[PDB]
Design a protein around this ligand. Structure first.
Ligand code: NA
Lengths: 84, 82
């Protein structure tokens, strides 16, 4: 989807650098550079995805925080429909 | 996603207030303000999708910048004729 391809990819590089196929074929110094860097992105998603949920839950409140007082107005006033 | 619910709410709350002659509402201002905010989210939501999008393509790039050189180095050593 985006955060998936990215993530997926990351999982797969590690998936490589760790394969016994390169026990010594890949620079032992290099294994680091990836793994680490891959995790960097791994975490960077987990963290960004979680931070997202908040800006969501922060707009959801500051939204109804405008509606509920009018709902709880029209709902007090005669008529009262709101039930989508 | 909880982003849906947000959308949903914004999307419903916006139409459930445009519905029809449900003008029992202060169907003029104290409704106008339910439109502005609602859409404010409708948009801000969007501006974030295409905001996240990028950051992903970004990080996705940065990680290759740390892998391409190495996988290239790999595709250069196990031949039987090359
Ligand atoms: Na006023």
């Amino acid at each position: 989807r985006g955060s998936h391809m990215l993530e997926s990819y990351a999982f797969n590089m590690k998936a490589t650098v760790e394969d016994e196929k390169l026990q010594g074929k890949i620079n032992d110094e290099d294994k680091q550079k990836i793994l680490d860097k891959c995790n960097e992105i791994i975490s960077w998603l987990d963290k960004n995805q979680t931070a997202e949920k908040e800006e969501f839950e922060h707009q959801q409140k500051e939204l109804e925080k405008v509606c509920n007082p009018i709902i709880t107005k029209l709902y007090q006033s005669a008529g009262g429909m709101p039930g989508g």
